[PDB]
């Protein structure tokens, strides 16, 4: 009755994988990136907008800056497919042979950029100035405003310098586009573009070129912040110039003296040398942080006359105790305040704080002069904790925050805020708060209480509500139009499997209006004028397409402006030759909880049959595997698995994202113990609904959390899973960083019971005695989850005698990048199932 | 935490250009392995024409090769290859253009010329050069 | 027809291996002390652990005088240290001063010392060892007693030489090279990595045996400057920290550290208090006095102190030359160019260095410690000594040579540039004491004993057969005839006494476990050479391995080029005629090691017997490249490491297929460790149709990443052998490995410091670029050798299973 997979040779498997990748259907390899819309005067030509973005038009394997003219009065019956015009004439932006310096390659690994060339850029609208980093250094060009829009590509101008290392993180000053800033050799620098002069404002890094001896850093994000909170900057420009022209820059200075150091092999294997990282493991000490200003004054010709740098009149750690992280920070649009978001250590109390620039005084070591600065501060200057969010599960960190430029109402301060711990779901709120003052005496030090600078709420109006949530992470934002009192956002109001665009009046919280067509998942970006928007969407059965829409309608009622399809920038492909799109389903558990999923039913199926199955699994938080998007290019190996006769079952059990807090809050302090029961419950269900599932031959397979879950299944459910192929697993939980483990697992001092039963390396005696029931894969250069985790597991297997197999990827970090390591990963994957399942 | 992304790579088309020069009876061949494009042929044609070299049309590889592969140039023993390997990779047009030269005294009954995959020993190309092309 | 091994579960293999190991150390180095009467006649000290606390400790035994013959005697194993622990196993070594009878050793945290003689009392009960209290920071290393004074001793603390006193407890730091890991590259009196590993030298200091005239004491050490040596990173044993350690690892083609010899004098009085303690150096820079000198092989003083000697080697390791340095050539380090130029002229005129004996070969120089300087009379003209030359006739033989010390009275004030033959002394006589197509054992702790009262030299060689080590004797005043002193049919490791009257023989055979027997020589006084050994007593007896072990069988054959090779085979248990069993070619195949010899293998390789109890044949043959067979035989590897050894393995494996019948040439694996692993991979590449599967253990994959001392000796530093390097590195020929899976296993220790984990890391990195499959087994806690028992069992279990399934 059963069905036995065909046996192939090793070269045969290599050939079928090479063929399945050749038949991919000529993917674009990149969709148009972040856009910018620039209006044009109508008398200048037939077009009305110019649209700038990033992409690779299949020509080169190099992401590049492109633009397109948005026509005027396009005719309806015929589809218009906009061009992709080059903007930099024959300028390659990847380094020679595609090898990056260690700083920028580590940053690319932190951002997961798998493309070469210009990855991001900074753009000043008024001057129309483009500034970016390409090859090994900074470049800039001008197309927008006074220069007049271009027709032919033009040459980018290299910014000459005298620094040694690489110039990181360029940022154009909004108040004046003649200057910019950057990070060099772990310190901060400000430079001019016209006069070519530079200046250094921070003196923290010795430059001794040894991570061990120079721990301090200024205006740069540490590791745990980059990885587990997704903030890739440490400096921020003040958007207004104060009156000589004075400019401000808020930045942070980190002190990593007491952070534990570890060694990681380097991409140069022959040297047999390692690189050291400040890696704070769970329970250890995080670095010391602080916030500092850095003024600088210029004259009419653009010369930096003075350049000071100030600090809080009290030690940062004194005004704000129980503060472990700086999630986000920035200014308001008038320049009257600088704000930041503080997280405590258990990650259960986030709070917005508002800081006036007047609280920053120059660094005066002479105690006599310092007591003069602490005397000259105005009375109404003090920190303002506008908002505080306390939960019982954990605080997910949002970027969504939009303060309104206040008129001469000295008491009030109104802003939107996507709060999530109030109802259990991420919803927008319009909150107005009165900035109460106390007229502190900064000369005498103060030990702040729990409610020192907390200002009382005047109103708190929910704008959205229901059993759904507003997209707030992974680069999702909101667009607020203050001429019509609206707010555009993205959420899952329709169904948890789709991302749609919405709009609602933030003055009167009326009815929400969807702006995208149902049946797809949309990733869209508005215009700054709120008349056009581009949407990138797809579905399970359709590859992505990128259309541009134009909001038309009567000007008196702006809420109901109808979205008109204007033009297209990319069409679907449908991947016809060998791709059967999976089928989404959903079931209930015995605890009455709805879960979703998908199944790749085997090709060439026959009734009264049974196929070997492969329960693909990630299971970890902040990841949703089942949604109505095109999985055809991301996970196509699962289609190849199905093409041979395997039945792939994906299931997003309790713990995943996009379903609220109380749903995700099932992992708290029980990580590992609960996610498998949802996988086996959702695997036995498919045995009822469908009949081709052979529960005798059940595999399991994951990566970096599913690798951890692959091992937990084989321990807890040895009779359900025959084999188990773990990938870059997390074996011991006491050797992972603070930003992630403490969020969910509550440092071992408190959860030593759960750390024991969650670490899979401490239960090695329950693994199978029989051979050929465990494969292990890990990358050698991995710095996210180090090779130690696999290395310590193998050590525990030998102390008990259990068999295993192992595959190491020497030139691969946490993500398989080169194709030869990708092919060899899949070729060896099929071969294990072919023989031992 | 995000699931690691396995890279996607597609092979590309390519052509192989054969050039020759005859001095008295000795032949110097110039073999070019280059991704199939337009500008590169009408550039390399002039670059070789400067040294009085000329082209000889022979079919390109049918299979789609990957960018970054190495290929052994093989023949019958009567040839002399100063570079024994060729490499398929994009090249800036205004910059230098790599090739492999071959020295043979007298062709006579025609000489074989083969490219062979370094990693798997695949015969992905061939050419039976004859004096008729000269 | 064919035979098929019975399949077992994982628990089955693990259980049979646990049982095999369930059904499985002789006394160490000895010293004799005469007991002036009493029932006994001697006292014998050694190291061992008797069936109890696992701890190598100091054990003494009373050799009785006038023992009876009718019954065998089995000495007791007395103790000396009452309930003492020596494990951080046990006391790994010690130093012994005979006259005062003082033992000094390092026990696992600190130094201890004891005394058994001199005080006219030999101890009766095990006594308490006394601790040498110190004020230093780290661990004391390499203690040595001063032969001229049993009160002062030397050691090494933090790469700097130190001298202490036992009676007064005072210390003193003689050298200040360590600034107190990479910032300080200078060290004082220590052997570096390459010297310790590839040249077998574990010390840097050398006391002067004779005090000169307050009394002065000299100590010859060397200073090493590792400034411009490369650095590598090796993981630390504590896996949790994820931190590595730095070592100076000069890889082939790189630059070895810069060496220099320096004395270190010090003076004391009747109370044993050090008054002065200077430090000196050569009047000319060491780099200028001896150009083309890369390594300092060995060093020491003569019997009377009138000279200090050393053995120099160049980078090609093809010119070893003895040198003789007088202590008058070492002047104090003087900064003022005036005081230097007066001391460079205030030394005697005849004082200079002499190149006593220059050995020039064409293959390479094996570093022999065999050299006996004879204390002569006033005898200023000549100088005679015994030296174990090997490059003269191609075999390691003994020689008596007398050389005259010519003098040129150099002006040591002016800078000198020495020529090709600056200090070469002309030879006066050179007579061979031994000869023939055999050799005198010289390396691996093997030495000679020269008796001067009777004019006899005792040495160990393979004069009978290359498979045995015996104790021979010959006269050095007259090259007479040699006399073997050990019973044939075995292989002994003897150790003479300081009185030349007794010798212990620790010996075993293929079919008999190791047993330690003491023999007392009794013979005519008129003929010392013809004195014949009498068996006296047995310290230890052979177990006999009765229930499950079956010893292999040694054979030999000839190759197509008529080169006699040896081999051995474990016959499969329960063999029937017409049955083709699956075999395993266990191999090392490298230099400096031989495996086929008449000694008990059942304790080092019993897994080879466990492999035989299952039904596998095992074939071990020592082809061209091994030791104990001359130089032109061993020197077949030169510039071709890899290209020769495997050719003799199949040449011999086929021979066993005809001499016997139970060899199934269709099913044969190949397995070795750290040079067999290199060869296993070279077999699966060159002979895929011969070998079914391969099991490489810690292989050397690329030769460009190995150290200088070992690679440059056999492989001609890369610039001059770019043909043999690429053709011998297996990680560069990956495209020829099998495509079928289940044909290649790879094991490696993670902490490996000799052949680092990078070798298999780079190889795996080349297996992926070629698409070939493999398996892998990593031992995170094992260095070059698998030490622990869990990691050892889990290695043999997975070795049986990989053979059970895929063979």
SS (H, E, C) B11-58: CECEEEEEEEEECCCCEEEEEEEEECCCHHHHHHHHHHHCCCCEEECC
Catalytic residue among A782, A786, A789, A836: A782
CA distance C460 to C490: 13
Structure tokens at B121: 């020993």
CB contact under 8 A, C239 and A269: no
CA distance A737 to C626: 52
What is the nearest CA distance from B115 to chain A, expressed in angstroms? 20
* Residue C752 designated active-site: yes
CB contact under 8 A, C10 and A771: yes
Chain B residues whose CB is inside 8 A of the C735 CB are: 118-121
Tell me if residue C630 falls in helix, strand or coil.
coil
The answer to whether B121 faces chain C, any CB pair under 8 Å, is yes
Place of tokens 């700097």: C160
Chain C residues whose CB is inside 8 A of the B118 CB are: 735
- The Cβ of residue C187 has, within 10 Å, a number of other Cβ atoms equal to 24
Give the strand order in the sheet containing A479-481: A479-481, A486-491, A500-505, A513-514
The answer to whether B119 faces chain C, any CB pair under 8 Å, is yes
Q: Are strands A583-588 and A594-600 parallel, antiparallel or unpaired?
A: antiparallel
Q: Residue window 87-106, chain B: list those with CB within 8 Å of chain A.
A: 90, 92
* Residue C372 designated active-site: no
Tell me if residue A740 falls in helix, strand or coil.
helix
Counting one residue from chain B and one from chain C, the pairs whose CB atoms sit within 8 A come to: 9
Neighbours, chain A (3 or more CB pairs < 8 A): B, C
Q: What is the resolution of this structure in A?
A: 3.2
CA distance A476 to A399: 8
CA dihedral A760, A765, A770, A772 (to 10 degrees): 20
Please give the distance of CA A770 from its chain centroid, rounded to a whole number.
Answer: 42
Close Cβ partners of A512 (under 8 Å, ≥ 6 residues apart):
A464, A493, A502, A503, A504
CA distance C723 to C735: 18
CA distance C796 to C786: 11
Q: Are strands C295-301 and A216-218 parallel, antiparallel or unpaired?
A: unpaired
**A803: Cα within 13 Å, side-chain hemisphere:** 22
- The Cβ of residue A87 has, within 10 Å, a number of other Cβ atoms equal to 18
Structure tokens at A696: 């005798």
Structure tokens at C40: 């006994």
Neighbours, chain C (3 or more CB pairs < 8 A): A, B
- The Cβ of residue A152 has, within 10 Å, a number of other Cβ atoms equal to 8
Structure tokens at B30: 């110039």
Counting one residue from chain A and one from chain C, the pairs whose CB atoms sit within 8 A come to: 107
What is the nearest CA distance from B35 to chain A, expressed in angstroms? 12
DSSP A331-349: E-TTSS-EEEEEE-TTS-E
In this complex, the residue of C11, C765, C780 whose CB is nearest that of residue A794 is: C780
Contact between A51 and A70 (Cβ < 8 Å): yes
CA distance A499 to A381: 43
Contact between B31 and B53 (Cβ < 8 Å): no
Apex A614 CA angle, A613 and A617, nearest 5: 145
* Residue C444 designated active-site: no
Residue in C200, C255, C251, C252 with CA at minimum distance from that of residue C225: C255
CB contact under 8 A, A262 and C242: yes
Query: In Å, how far are A516, A565, A741, C514, C793 from C604, measured between CA atoms?
Result: 76, 81, 48, 12, 14
CA distance C337 to A424: 86
Q: How many residues does chain A have?
A: 837
For A822, the closest chain C residue by CA position comes to C768
Structure-determination technique: cryo-EM
Chain B residues whose CB is inside 8 A of the C770 CB are: 119-120
Contact between C565 and C648 (Cβ < 8 Å): yes
Residue in C127, C142, C233 with CA at minimum distance from that of residue C187: C142
Contact between A28 and B10 (Cβ < 8 Å): no
Query: In Å, how far are A89, A445, A446, C750 from A315, measured between CA atoms?
Result: 51, 10, 10, 47
The answer to whether C770 faces chain B, any CB pair under 8 Å, is yes
Catalytic residue among C178, C784, C801, C806: C784
Residue in C295, C402, C312 with CA at minimum distance from that of residue C353: C312
Give the H/E segment covering residue A640.
helix A637-644
Please give the distance of CA C719 from its chain centroid, rounded to a whole number.
Answer: 30
Apex C492 CA angle, C487 and C495, nearest 5: 110
Chain A residues whose CB is inside 8 A of the B8 CB are: 21, 24, 27, 29, 633
Structure tokens at A378: 């105005």
Give the strand order in the sheet containing C308-313: C295-301, C308-313, C319-325, C358-360
Q: Are strands A384-390 and A401-403 parallel, antiparallel or unpaired?
A: unpaired
Chain C residues whose CB is inside 8 A of the B121 CB are: 735
CA distance C471 to A810: 52
CA distance C707 to C721: 16
Q: What is the largest CA-CA distance in chain C?
A: 91
Provide the 8-state DSSP code for A819.
H
Contact between A154 and A146 (Cβ < 8 Å): no
Question: Burial of C34 by CB count in 10 Å (0-12 exposed, 13-18 middle, 19+ buried)?
Answer: middle
Beta bridge partners of A390: A349
Beta strands in C339-445 (DSSP E): 358-360, 371-373, 382-387, 399-404, 427-432
Place of tokens 């003494």: C60
What is the nearest CA distance from C758 to chain B, expressed in angstroms? 22
| Per-residue exposure over A4-34, b if at least 16 CB sit within 10 Å of its own CB, e if not | ebeeeebeebbebbbebbeebbebbbbbbbe
Please give the distance of CA C49 from its chain centroid, rounded to a whole number.
Answer: 23
- Return the sign of the alpha-carbon dihedral for residues B77, B81, B87, B93: negative
Contact between A309 and A297 (Cβ < 8 Å): no
Structure tokens at C526: 């008129």
Tell me if residue A668 falls in helix, strand or coil.
coil
Give the H/E segment covering residue C793.
helix C790-806
Close Cβ partners of C313 (under 8 Å, ≥ 6 residues apart):
C293, C294, C295, C296, C297, C319, C320, C365, C367
Contact between C396 and C437 (Cβ < 8 Å): no
CA distance B103 to C621: 48
Query: In Å, how far are A229, B11, C107, C530 from C475, measured between CA atoms?
Result: 84, 80, 41, 11
Beta bridge partners of B15: B34
Chain C residues whose CB is inside 8 A of the A269 CB are: 758, 761-762, 765
CB contact under 8 A, B121 and C769: no
CA distance C434 to A18: 69
Give the strand order in the sheet containing A129-134: A122-124, A129-134, A137-142, A157-158
Close Cβ partners of A38 (under 8 Å, ≥ 6 residues apart):
A49, A50, A51, A52, A125, A128, A144
CA distance A472 to A329: 16
Contact between C57 and C81 (Cβ < 8 Å): yes
CA distance C142 to C154: 8
CA distance A551 to B1: 37
CA distance C370 to C355: 17
Q: Which domains does chain C have, with CATH numbers?
A: 10-23+545-806 (3.40.50.1820), 29-540 (2.140.10.30)
CA distance C638 to C636: 6
Give the H/E segment covering residue A237.
strand A235-237
CA distance A302 to A289: 32
Contact between A564 and A549 (Cβ < 8 Å): yes
Beta strands in C166-255 (DSSP E): 171-173, 186-188, 206-207, 215-217, 219-225, 231-235, 244-248
CA distance B11 to A823: 13
């Amino acid at each position: 009755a059963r069905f036995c997979v065909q046996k192939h040779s090793w070269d045969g498997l290599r050939n079928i994988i090479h063929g399945s990748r050749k038949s991919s259907g000529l993917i674009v390899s990149k969709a148009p990136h972040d856009f910018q819309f620039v209006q044009k005067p109508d008398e200048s030509g037939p077009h009305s907008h110019r649209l700038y973005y990033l992409g690779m038009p299949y020509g080169s394997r190099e992401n590049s800056l492109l633009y397109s003219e948005i026509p005027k009065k396009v005719r309806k019956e015929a589809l218009l497919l906009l061009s992709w015009k080059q903007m930099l004439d024959h300028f390659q932006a990847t380094p020679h042979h595609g090898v990056y310096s260690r700083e920028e390659e580590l940053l690319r690994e932190r951002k997961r950029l798998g493309v070469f060339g210009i990855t991001s850029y900074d753009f000043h609208s008024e001057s129309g100035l483009f500034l970016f980093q390409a090859s090994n250094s900074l470049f800039h060009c001008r197309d927008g405003g006074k220069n007049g829009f271009m027709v032919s590509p033009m040459k980018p101008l290299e910014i000459k310098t005298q620094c040694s290392g690489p110039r990181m993180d360029p940022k154009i000053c909004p108040a004046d586009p003649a200057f910019f800033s950057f990070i060099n050799n772990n310190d901060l620098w400000v430079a001019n573009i016209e006069t070519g002069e530079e200046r250094r404002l921070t003196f923290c890094h010795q430059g001794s070129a040894s991570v061990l001896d120079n721990p301090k850093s200024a205006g740069v994000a540490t590791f745990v912040i980059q990885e587990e909170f997704d903030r890739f900057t440490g400096c921020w420009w003040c958007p207004t110039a104060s009156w000589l022209k004075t400019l401000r820059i808020l930045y942070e200075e980190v002190d990593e003296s007491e952070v534990e150091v570890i060694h990681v092999p380097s991409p140069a294997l022959e040297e047999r040398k390692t690189d050291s990282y400040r890696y704070p493991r769970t329970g250890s000490k995080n670095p010391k942080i602080a916030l500092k200003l850095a003024e600088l004054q210029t004259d009419h010709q653009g010369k930096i006359v003075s350049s000071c740098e100030k600090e809080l009149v009290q030690p940062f750690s004194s005004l704000f105790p129980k503060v472990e992280y700086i999630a986000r920070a920035g200014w308001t649009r008038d320049g009257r305040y600088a704000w930041a978001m503080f997280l405590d250590r258990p990650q259960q109390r986030l709070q917005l704080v508002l800081l006036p620039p007047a609280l920053f005084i120059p660094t005066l070591e002479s105690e006599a002069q310092w007591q003069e600065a602490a005397r000259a501060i105005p009375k109404n200057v003090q920190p303002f904790i506008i908002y505080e969010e306390v939960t019982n599960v954990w605080i997910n960190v949002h970027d969504i925050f939009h303060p309104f430029p206040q008129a001469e109402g000295q008491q009030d301060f109104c802003f939107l805020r996507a709060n999530e711990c109030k109802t259990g779901f991420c919803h927008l709120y319009r909150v107005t708060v009165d900035l109460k003052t106390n007229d502190y005496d900064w000369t005498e030090p103060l030990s702040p209480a729990e409610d020192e600078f907390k200002c009382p709420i005047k109103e708190e109006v929910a704008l959205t509500s229901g059993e759904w949530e507003v997209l707030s992470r992974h680069g999702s934002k909101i667009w607020v139009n203050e001429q019509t009192k609206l707010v555009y956002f993205q959420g899952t109001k329709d169904t948890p499997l789709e991302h749609h665009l919405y709009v609602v009046s933030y003055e009167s919280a009326g009815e929400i209006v969807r702006l995208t067509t149902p049946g797809f998942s949309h990733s869209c970006s508005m215009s700054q004028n709120f008349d056009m928007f581009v949407s990138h969407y797809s579905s399970v059965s359709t590859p992505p397409c990128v259309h541009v829409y134009k909001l038309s309608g009567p000007d008196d009622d702006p809420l109901h402006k109808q979205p008109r399809f204007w033009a297209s920038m990319m069409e679907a492909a449908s991947c016809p030759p060998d791709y059967v799109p999976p089928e989404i389903f959903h079931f209930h558990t015995r605890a009455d909880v709805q879960l979703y999923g998908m199944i790749y039913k085997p090709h060439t199926l026959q009734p009264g049959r049974k196929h070997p199955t492969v329960l693909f699994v990630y299971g970890g938080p902040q990841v949703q595997l089942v949604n109505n998007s095109f999985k055809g290019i991301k996970y196509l190996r699962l289609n190849t698995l199905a093409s041979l006769g395997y039945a792939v079952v994906v299931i997003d059990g309790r713990g995943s994202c996009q379903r609220g807090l109380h749903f995700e809050g099932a992992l708290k302090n029980q990580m590992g113990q609960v996610e498998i029961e949802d996988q086996v419950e959702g695997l036995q269900y498919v045995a009822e609904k469908y009949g081709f599932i052979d529960l005798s031959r059940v595999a399991i397979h994951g990566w970096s959390y599913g690798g951890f879950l692959s091992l937990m299944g084989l321990i807890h459910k040895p009779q359900v899973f025959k084999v188990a192929i773990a990938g870059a697993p997390v074996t011991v939980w006491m050797a992972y960083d603070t930003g992630y483990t403490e969020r969910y697992m509550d440092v071992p001092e408190n959860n030593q019971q759960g750390y024991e039963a969650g670490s899979v390396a401490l239960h090695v005696e329950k693994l199978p005695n029989e051979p050929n029931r465990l494969l292990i894969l890990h990358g050698f250069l991995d710095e996210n989850v180090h090779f130690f985790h696999t290395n310590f597991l193998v050590s525990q297997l030998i102390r008990a005698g259990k068999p295993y197999q192992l595959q190491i990827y020497p030139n691969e970090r946490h993500s398989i990048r080169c194709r030869e390591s990708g092919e060899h990963y899949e070729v060896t994957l099929l071969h294990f199932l072919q023989e031992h399942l | 935490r995000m699931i690691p992304a396995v890279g996607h790579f597609i092979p590309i088309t390519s052509i192989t250009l054969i050039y020759y020069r005859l001095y008295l009876e000795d032949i110097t061949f110039h073999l070019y392995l280059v991704p199939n494009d337009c500008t590169i042929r009408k550039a390399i044609d002039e670059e070789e024409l400067k040294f009085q070299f000329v082209r000889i049309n022979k079919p390109p590889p049918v299979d789609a090769l990957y960018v970054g592969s190495r290929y052994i140039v093989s023949s019958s023993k009567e040839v002399e290859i100063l570079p024994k390997e060729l490499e398929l990779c994009y090249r800036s047009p205004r910059e230098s253009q790599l090739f492999s030269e071959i020295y043979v005294g007298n062709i006579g009954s025609g000489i074989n010329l083969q490219l062979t995959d370094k990693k798997y020993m695949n015969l992905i190309w061939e050419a039976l050069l004859k004096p008729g092309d000269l």
